[PDB]
């Protein structure tokens, strides 16, 4: 199968500024019929993939002129003259010259915005999870940027790395921020053998770590 | 215009066969075009699987040929994907699409998990806090397979909501969702987490009660 390679895998762009993606194929995409069936596809968070470009440079219906495709043979480019927030998502180049049709490795476009500190919130095990004999401690880190962040769980001052489930939302096109969930799963009995539960986040927006903490013997 | 809508079993046992339906609305699949199945693996890789054209002619990705078939029912305006000898590696989001013949429009996709693990309903826990804003949470734990649907106040609360992708831990999924409102909105105005797990026919409504 024809291999499609994209560069870069990641793109961070300011609104109103140009963005571009390179695509390369393992062999020429120029068909015997004289045409080059190179396509571009956009997948926004929470939406179906959507056609942007076909035949290297032809615009699909509803696609703004801001999008521009070019290239030939094995080398192709997608250019967005003026980036808007709705442009964030994952971008795929793919070829339809050769059978089977094949897709390239995606490029993720993120909207570069001003730095924003995380809203950090800690949650002791719910009175419902505890009664049922369970104990999960949860830390939300909401609406921050950039994505770079350090989050540590400390139980009785001791850093925990086992049983820590971290999950990230896609960048929110409404505020260009990220949010992350951190969950430490214990048992009812282990939770009861410790006192202090601390979520500590390090982010460039603050010189001191953002710390949320609770003590069992105070709830 | 044309609407595409995928449907089928969300969980199939290894070695058995996968069966998916794409229901088309607004246009007869017999009129024109090629009707494709494409799948997206965890990690977002896309693979074209094959198509059936308006005449009923099929074409399959050579990597799957001995294992795949695409058929149709012109009376129902549907076409179908059939994938045999499935393994966990066949776990993916399956999309139907159409083009002339290169795909031009895509469906919403449907998740298909291939595994021997058993269906398990989720436990749903309300996360109440211990600033100007206040964050509430919902913890959906120990379910299988994906997906669940989660809403706040039966969907009437959508702003300030962050629903995090499920993480698979020990053949069980955990998912969480947060909602942020003004500090003087809750608990004066009640907030409830609604979780549906179609696989187990589960539907839970858990109100976020403030802690003592």
């Amino acid at each position: 199968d024809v291999v499609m390679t994209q560069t870069p895998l990641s793109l961070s762009v300011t609104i109103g500024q140009p963005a571009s993606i390179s695509c390369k194929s393992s062999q020429s995409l120029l068909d015997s019929d004289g045409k080059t069936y190179l396509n571009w596809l956009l997948q926004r968070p929470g939406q179906s993939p959507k056609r942007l470009i076909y035949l290297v440079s032809k615009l699909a219906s509803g696609v703004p002129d801001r999008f521009t495709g070019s290239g030939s043979g094995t080398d192709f480019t997608l250019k967005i003259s003026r980036v808007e927030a709705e442009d964030l998502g994952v971008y795929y180049c793919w070829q339809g010259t050769h059978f089977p049709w094949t897709f390239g490795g995606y490029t993720k476009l993120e909207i570069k915005r001003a730095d924003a500190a995380p809203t950090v919130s800690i949650f002791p095990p719910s009175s419902e999870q505890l009664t049922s004999g369970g104990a999960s401690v949860v830390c939300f880190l909401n609406n921050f940027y950039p994505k770079d962040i350090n989050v540590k769980w400390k139980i009785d001052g001791s850093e925990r790395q086992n049983g820590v489930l971290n999950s990230w939302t896609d960048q929110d096109s409404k505020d260009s921020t990220y949010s992350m969930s951190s969950t430490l799963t214990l048992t009812k009995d282990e939770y009861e053998r410790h006192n202090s539960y601390t979520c500590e986040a390090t982010h460039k927006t603050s010189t001191s770590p953002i710390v949320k903490s609770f003590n069992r013997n105070e709830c | 215009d044309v609407q595409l809508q995928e449907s089928g079993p969300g969980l199939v046992k290894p070695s058995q066969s996968l069966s998916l339906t794409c229901t088309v609305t607004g246009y007869s699949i017999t009129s024109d075009y090629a009707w494709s199945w494409i799948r997206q693996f965890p990690g977002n890789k896309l693979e074209w699987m094959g198509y059936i054209n308006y005449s009923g002619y099929t074409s399959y990705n050579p990597s799957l040929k001995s294992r795949i078939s695409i058929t149709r029912d012109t009376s129902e305006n549907q076409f179908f994907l059939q994938l045999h000898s499935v393994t966990p590696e066949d776990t993916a989001t399956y999309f139907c699409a159409y083009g002339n013949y290169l795909p031009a429009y895509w469906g919403q996709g449907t998740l298909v998990t291939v595994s021997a693990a058993k269906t398990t309903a989720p436990s749903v826990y309300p996360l109440a806090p211990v600033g100007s804003s206040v964050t509430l949470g919902c913890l959906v734990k120990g379910y299988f397979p994906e997906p669940v649907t989660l809403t706040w106040n039966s969907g009437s609360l959508s702003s300030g909501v962050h629903t995090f992708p499920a993480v698979l831990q020990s053949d069980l999924y955990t998912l969480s969702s947060s909602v942020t409102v003004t500090s003087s909105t809750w608990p004066s105005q009640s907030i409830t987490c609604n979780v549906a797990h179609p696989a187990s026919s589960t539907k839970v409504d858990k109100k976020i009660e403030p802690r003592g």
Binding site: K35, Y54, K58, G96, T97 | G99
Partner: peptide, 7 residues
């Protein structure tokens, strides 16, 4: 939709 080589 415009016709491509496969159509």
């Amino acid at each position: 939709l415009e016709l491509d080589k496969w159509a």
